[PDB]
Amino acid sequence: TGYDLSVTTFSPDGRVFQIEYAAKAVDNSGTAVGIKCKDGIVLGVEKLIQSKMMLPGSNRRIHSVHRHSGMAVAGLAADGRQIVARAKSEATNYESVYGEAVPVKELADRVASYVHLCTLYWWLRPFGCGVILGGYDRDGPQLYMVEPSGISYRYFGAAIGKGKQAAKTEIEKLKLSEMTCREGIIEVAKIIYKVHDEAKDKAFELEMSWICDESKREHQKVPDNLLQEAKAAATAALE
Amino acid sequence: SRRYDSRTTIFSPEGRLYQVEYAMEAIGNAGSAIGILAKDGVVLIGEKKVTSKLLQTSTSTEKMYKIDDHVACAVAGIMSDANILINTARVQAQRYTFSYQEPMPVEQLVQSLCDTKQGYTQFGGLRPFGVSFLFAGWDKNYGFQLYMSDPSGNYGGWKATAIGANNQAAQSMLKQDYKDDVTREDAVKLALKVLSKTMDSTSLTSEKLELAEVYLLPSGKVKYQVHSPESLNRLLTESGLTQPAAETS
Amino acid sequence: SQYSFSLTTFSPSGKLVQIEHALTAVGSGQTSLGIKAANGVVIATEKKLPSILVDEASVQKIQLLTPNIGVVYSGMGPDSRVLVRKSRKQAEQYYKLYKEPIPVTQLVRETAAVMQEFTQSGGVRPFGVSLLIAGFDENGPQLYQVDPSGSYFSWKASAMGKNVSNAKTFLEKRYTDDMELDDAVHTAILTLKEGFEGQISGKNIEIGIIGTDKKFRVLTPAEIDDYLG
Amino acid sequence: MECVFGLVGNGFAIIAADTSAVNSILVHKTNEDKIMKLDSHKLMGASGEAGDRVQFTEFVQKNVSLYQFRNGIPLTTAAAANFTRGELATALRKNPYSVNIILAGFDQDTGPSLYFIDYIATLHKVDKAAFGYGSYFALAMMDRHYRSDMSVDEAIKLVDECIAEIRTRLVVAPPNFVIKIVDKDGAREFAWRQSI
Amino acid sequence: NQYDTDVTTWSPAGRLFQVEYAMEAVKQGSAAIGLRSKTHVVLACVNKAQSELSSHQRKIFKVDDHIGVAIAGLTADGRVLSRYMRSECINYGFTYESSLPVGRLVVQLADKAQVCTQRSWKRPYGVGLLVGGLDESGAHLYYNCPSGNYFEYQAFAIGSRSQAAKTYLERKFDTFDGATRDELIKHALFSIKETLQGEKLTSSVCTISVVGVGEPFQTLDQQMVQDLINS
Amino acid sequence: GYDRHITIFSPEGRLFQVEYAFKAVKSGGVTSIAVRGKDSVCVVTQKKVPDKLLDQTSVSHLFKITKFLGLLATGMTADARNLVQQARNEAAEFRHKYGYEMPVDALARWIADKSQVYTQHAYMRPLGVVAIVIGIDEENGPQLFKCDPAGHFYGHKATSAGSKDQEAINFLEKKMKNDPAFSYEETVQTAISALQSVLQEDFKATEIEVGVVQVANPVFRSLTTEEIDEHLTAISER
Amino acid sequence: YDRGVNTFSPEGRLFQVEYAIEAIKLGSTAIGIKTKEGVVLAVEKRITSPLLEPSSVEKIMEIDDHIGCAMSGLIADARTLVEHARVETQNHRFSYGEPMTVESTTQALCDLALRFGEGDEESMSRPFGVSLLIAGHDENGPSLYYTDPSGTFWQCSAKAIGSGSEGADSSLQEQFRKDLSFQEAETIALSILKQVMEEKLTPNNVDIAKVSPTYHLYSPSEVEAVIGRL
Amino acid sequence: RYDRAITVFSPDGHLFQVEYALEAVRKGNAAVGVRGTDTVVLGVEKKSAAKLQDSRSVRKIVNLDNHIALACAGLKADARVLINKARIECQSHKLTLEDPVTVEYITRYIAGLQQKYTQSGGVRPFGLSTLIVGFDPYTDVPALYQTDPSGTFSAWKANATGRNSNSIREFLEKNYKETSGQETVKLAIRALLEVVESGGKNLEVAVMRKEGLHQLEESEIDAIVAEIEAEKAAAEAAKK
Structure with missing residues (x-):
């Protein structure tokens, strides 16, 4: 009724509607899952093929941020790239000034502060993307998730996009303390395949990146062989 | 953010700027003041708008200000902005006397102030100064001068003019009664007469008035001076006696 | 960052509406008043707090800007702090340049210009406050008032905030020249008592006074109670 | 290097100056007129680096003309001198001009005047002035024969004598001098002193 | 709204x-095609003059020896x-004396x-670039x-009436990956023909530019494409 | 007009x-309270995780602005973190520029002055967070302060924030009418009890967080869950 | 409404840009025809009153020794574009000592067209309500281009802008023969400009210019000769 | 800085703010200029003589240079800024080039300045329409120009601006002839009289000779007004 038109305007209910519209943009995007296994972190993203001519590997959605951490973005991908670039900038700047690799916790805090700042200005559009960090610090694996409003918390499992609720419910049914990242691959592949609904959307390509001990704590894509076998297992798990 | 912009500097379909016209209205709601360009001097008289009895009145002036040794002004409109404008005007006069080492001729001071006002009138999107000035001073160029400034940033020289509340009645009586060769005393008397006849209340009170005159001392020194309350009382009594001294027939 | 569009334009009637809203906003603030005795000045205000749990001693409404000068505000509290800080800064600039205390009138004029700035500059609202600046200096006692429009006046006595009219009439009828400083203090306390719902106590109101040639001091509750007793 | 000097008679202020423009050893020109007219009633002899002399003199003339048309009343001589001094003093610490200026003028209500303005921007209303190596001879001879009421004949005789001495005793003696006079009628050229 | x-x-x-209005701006452009093999990219564009x-x-357009653009x-x-x-591309060549990879230029462009x-x-920019390098x-x-x-696509089309070419490619994109230069050129020509509203295809309506792992960027001449169309 | 949308004066x-910012604070369900004692200052709030997934150690509203200053932020979490970063930048800058620890009242005044800025500059929404500052002034003894989105910092002997302002205040001033001098244990247990009497439910010492200062130990500290549990038992048995 | 200067419309x-394109519809008709010999330009001056000095109303302005320019729409906004083109062509002469090609000047003028906006990123706040013909000769031979406030241009064999656009373009397509000798080319442009013009074609009412090797604005006596030939 | 597109295109291609500037011009004092063979007269409607104005220190027809003069119509407040910049340019041209500005040059400079304002962001167009006059140096051939709020300019044999500009323009269109000496002043006075029938006490007239500008005296304007007022009645009686 005139109040839902700016980011510097509280609606009489004491809430900012522009932030909620941004968050809705994420809700419309596509699932992004992160899991904190015993020996690392596994990120997985349901990536939707818009047209069959796309090249398998197009518009990758799981990005590195620095040597020991990486992101998965859901929501408006163009904003996800801006946030990933900022996370890279923060990582390298801290590395430079203090001569130490950024504690993933500090990296997430800086990223979240940036996302929040991008709302305080009347002349900026708030980011319409939510991200998941999974760095493997000297304090161990630790998974964060930053919301388009600027809030962030450390999770043991996470999810965003269309598949929020199914993904969360399925994660809770898993004993994260007991599964190695190799088991996390299978679990996340199975979850992503369950949460997808071919009856509604077109096909999709699972894109998963492990920040584990095999990956030498360095964020990397899941090896092709393990990924394909996990895809086959996840498909078999639907019956 | 665009929707919150009033666009102060913009032409209306009539070809006239609204905010400046509203500024002239604001002047119209302010206390009255008039100027008389006499042969031997220039006289400014003003009406103190706020006249609560608890006001101190010990402060020398509320509407007339000295801008330099040779120029003074009487303010109408928003005195808050008038303070800034007089501060600027004094600064401009001193800037001329520094660069050239001599008094800044009145017309130039008026024009510089008006160029300050026109800036707000034309660009930047800020509200114009809602003020209007009467300037009294003396030059080697032209001797005694009286000028009037609109908040439009426009000005003109006047043998006798008025600003503020009830402007036009005083203007008309000045048209009817002002004459060349009006001397010091005659100018003072005429100003008092026209004002009181323009006032809602006769037998005015010195506490509700201000009279200043920029004349020339015998030794060629422009002497500005604002009358003390007792001098106002003397003039008020003399005028309230001389008005019936003419109206008797 | 354009933010260069006066949000306080001229209404078709010539009135500056937003300044009028600011004047109302002070009109709904707690009352304050000031009187100038023939040999000193006095300012006081009501300091009634929403709860007992609020430590009344942790904040003062009467604040002195220079040892000669003190101010009282009515309307929004946060704005008065801005204005006090800026006025202190200007007083210290004056003292740096000339090694003398700033005259009351000059401090008032500079604070008034600060007030005015926000009524023309874009992207900001005028201060929801009016100030009573009490000072005593080389040319006698002085009490000045400043309002969100940036205009200032010299009063013999004045008030503002909640209950303006009753306090104003009370002062007008009860004020007189040659009033001593103590008479002025009693008169101010009585004026506060007039409209002060509840009962006055040293922990409910705040008083500041400047003696002859001396420093502006804010009365402590231990002695205001002696005055009102 | 330039020589310039002035002289205030009863109703006139003469200014003379050498008219030789040089580079190092070559008199590229001997007709270089250096005494400017600021107004119908002003002269401004200048001495200093030729580029700075010309640029500063033109700048000051621009400002004088701007004042004239905008107000309708021309700058009085004293105000023109003070404005020159102000501009020169402000440039002094930022991008100094190396020009020495002698300003003469006539104003109906004040009479002839002659101002001394140094490249350091020191201004003084002098009775007689001179700049450059010819300054010594010019000043001594003027002092010897100067009076406060000289007829233009006497003033021009004095300037001729000063020119002859400056030629005779300087090593950089320039051969050609120009003489310009300001009176009630206005700034003007009096005579050209061809030597060659 | x-x-x-x-x-x-x-x-x-x-x-x-x-942003969606900007993205609609593209649809008023003419059919810009593009189809990729593992070694080659072919950008073909349908040319519509505003009068006889x-x-x-x-x-x-050419961006450098190894990148082209169809806007x-x-x-x-x-x-x-x-x-x-x-x-x-020039700045990267100047600093590293090597060709800027397509992907990084594209991502900087998207930023x-x-x-x-x-x-x-x-x-927004309101121009949809179809980068191929x-x-x-x-x-x-x-x-x-x-x-x-x-x-990133094995093939694609944009602009007004770009649906017909897109729908031909979706039939034949399975073959591009292993296709030679000539076969990609043929596919670009046919994909354009599908855009023309019953007009016989001719060199005078479309321009074809090809870039290859061994070839720099080049826009095929008016006559060679005509000769190829005569098959 | 626009005055409902931007911080310019309403016709009255x-x-x-600013009012809507206050409503935003009272939104979010959380409520918190602080009790200043003779010897300590205790500040307590409730935190709740809805998921097994969310790590409980990553969610908290107690912030160590300085080893000797704390701050309990009530309101929107992102704004609470922005204000917290700003205050941490100020505390370090004050200590650097002036050579001694920043006093509690100075922190409260600075936060309030910063908040006032949003309230005057039209295009800057006021932060939706009420921040309670606790610390033991080196000379004034224990301190407690409360800054609001408007900018009215005032010092409170006891105070509440969040959805249950009034209930907490009423209970606290009922229990404090006598102007008591609370011991440490008594202070913290009064705070916990006033929270209980507002929530109308018990709590397992896990959905609650407490932060305390002491003259014998000025460091702003967060109580162990076992200490919270001992305080709960002590409340139970009297 | 207070739609921004840069607001996209739903299509x-x-x-x-659309509102600017509308502004050329009100401008004087200006017509040009390319040919092997050179290029010709013409434009109705629109001399409102006899007092106005015809010669002082210039709508064909030289950009450089080989690049004419016919202006239509807001002739105030056209001056600025031509001044920019003049400085750009001279810079290119300075920086290479050779004439800037015509297509590059056109692209130089057009690259200025869309710079408008708000926010201190560009001083211009509004599009140029001017569409120009650029008639030049360079290494490619005679060439004629034209532009519109959409910051776009394209080479053409004959074009007519301003109010008469549609009629002049129809008559041009019906008659532009591609064998035209310069003599025929200019009579065709003048005959088209005659019918579009409400006032009778007189030496003073029209402005003709031949690019050929070097730009030449026809003098009134020269215009009378071709009006007679027509 | 404040950037806002005050001047913008209306859905039918018009610049509304420029046209409102033109209307602001319509409301200004009438002005007339009549280029003759040897002189260029200017005139304006009001000489500031409403029985109390102290008009000693300001003339409406203003010198940009001893070479050049200017008459302005429309807002008086903007005229001062435009005239100051024109004077500054007249001097800066002499500095940059020894030659004084030719009339067309300064006219073009003013015109471009006005256009810049109609297109620069965050600034109001000048509401002016100037008449400019002068003798191009070394030519002794008079020159008459005008600019209009749009920023477009052109020369004229004669012209008018301000209120009733049209009526004066028709008068000139029917009554203009190649005048000289006093005849140019006669035509200018008649042209102004068409609209300001209260002749004499209202007109302010100046004439540009090759040697500069000089403004007629009250007695002189009155003499011309009386001459026309007698000869027109005589001609009307003779014809009728």
């Missing part, structure tokens, strides 16, 4: 309408983006485009919508 | 956006 |  006048105003449905006497508007949308913005891409969709005083991996084809997003 | 002199 | 077209 009031969530529509400024870029920085999200719509309550999670949509950004000014007046000539058409150029739409294919759709308003040309005033295609020119600025092409100049920017050329400048970046440049997105930056405009986030600030109040700026507007070379990397160490071989050939690559991208598409940059004014929204700031970018995609 | 109210700034509606 | 993808900038509003202000």
